[PDB]
Design a protein around this ligand. Structure first.
Ligand SMILES: CC(=O)N[C@@H]1[C@@H](O)[C@H](O[C@@H]2O[C@H](CO)[C@@H](O[C@@H]3O[C@H](CO[C@H]4O[C@H](CO)[C@@H](O)[C@H](O)[C@@H]4O[C@@H]4O[C@H](CO)[C@@H](O)[C@H](O)[C@H]4NC(C)=O)[C@@H](O)[C@H](O[C@H]4O[C@H](CO)[C@@H](O)[C@H](O)[C@@H]4O[C@@H]4O[C@H](CO)[C@@H](O)[C@H](O)[C@H]4NC(C)=O)[C@@H]3O)[C@H](O)[C@H]2NC(C)=O)[C@@H](CO)O[C@H]1O
Ligand SMILES: [Ca+2]
Length: 129
């Protein structure tokens, strides 16, 4: 079971929220919905979020926040501290442009590193009931 207006995949529920929110603000928003920024650590979870991005007309540059973060030099999922294993970086990413690209988001439907105060839409996940 997933809540109404959310998209189901295996044991997860996702939702796209149109916003102009920093990564931190987006996290706070997902937490109020009982969830977290989406952490697509499998190829198929990414395909589902990508489909949602296309559905919401957010398939180009400065696509939505995801829950990956760069702590020091290490790319990891926020909720778990897990180092990225499966990767979905876009071509020539990550590139750390301007030196402060410490948050994960979709850029042209691929992962990119972006400055965390950039204002974007966001994707949340929660456990299915
Ligand atoms: C109001 C006003 O006038 N404001 C302007 C303000 O717009 C402007 O900011 C610049 O805006 C432009 C236009 O949106 C930006 O250009 C696009 O950037 C996106 C975002 O990704 C880049 O930027 C972020 C940082 O913000 C960074 O995290 C990413 O890594 C990426 O940086 C770039 O990485 C490249 C490798 O990935 C490097 O080689 C670059 O040097 C590096 N850029 C920087 C700034 O360091 C980006 O996605 C866009 O790229 C698409 O479009 C171009 C042109 O068509 C293509 O050449 C690209 O290949 C890419 O196209 C897409 O590529 C996909 C695969 O990658 C394909 O799947 C897609 O189909 C294809 N899509 C299309 C439509 O062809 C742009 O490059 C830019 O970042 C802003 N800043 C700068 C400095 O340019 C500022 C700046 O002057 O001025 C204000 O006045
Ligand atoms: Ca980048």
């Amino acid at each position: 079971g997933c809540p109404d207006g959310w998209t189901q995949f295996l044991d997860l529920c996702y939702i796209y929220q149109s916003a102009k929110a920093s990564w931190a603000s987006a996290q706070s928003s997902c937490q109020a919905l009982g969830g977290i920024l989406a952490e697509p650590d499998t190829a198929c979870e990414n395909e589902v979020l990508i489909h949602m991005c296309k559905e919401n007309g957010d398939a180009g540059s400065f696509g939505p926040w995801l829950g990956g973060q760069k702590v020091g030099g290490a790319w990891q999922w926020s909720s778990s501290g897990a180092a990225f294993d499966y990767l979905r970086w876009g071509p020539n990413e990550p590139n750390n442009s301007g030196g402060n690209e410490d948050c994960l988001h979709y850029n042209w439907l691929s992962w990119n590193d972006l400055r965390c105060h950039y204002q974007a839409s966001y994707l949340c996940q929660r456990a299915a009931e």
